[PDB]
């Protein structure tokens, strides 16, 4: 199934994860059909350690919607924020 999760990540000075996807982006390693923004790698001793995992779909960040967001806009937002970033993600969970 799926679930939404709030995730706070404190930049130090990066978030410590990578993303792929977005409208106008090249897709993602997880779902062919989805234009969403997906977490693809998490630095193991970085700020997102234990909080995010590859395959998490970002649908909001500091109150900005990431649903069908363009690739460049998502990168710009995440890179522009400072200090704390409050994410909402959709995580797939084992049946």
């Amino acid at each position: 199934g799926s679930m939404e999760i709030r995730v706070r990540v404190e930049k130090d000075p990066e978030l410590g994860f990578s993303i792929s996807g977005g409208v106008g982006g090249r897709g993602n390693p997880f779902r062919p059909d989805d234009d969403g923004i997906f977490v693809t790698r998490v630095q193991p001793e970085g700020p997102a350690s234990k909080l995010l995992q590859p395959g998490d779909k970002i649908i909001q960040a500091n109150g900005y919607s990431f649903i069908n967001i363009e690739h460049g806009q998502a990168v710009s937002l995440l890179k522009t924020f400072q200090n704390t970033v409050e994410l909402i993600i959709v995580r797939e969970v084992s049946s």
Binding site: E14, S18, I19, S20
Partner: peptide, 5 residues
């Protein structure tokens, strides 16, 4: 290419 943030 993924993008580190």
């Amino acid at each position: 290419l993924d993008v580190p943030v």
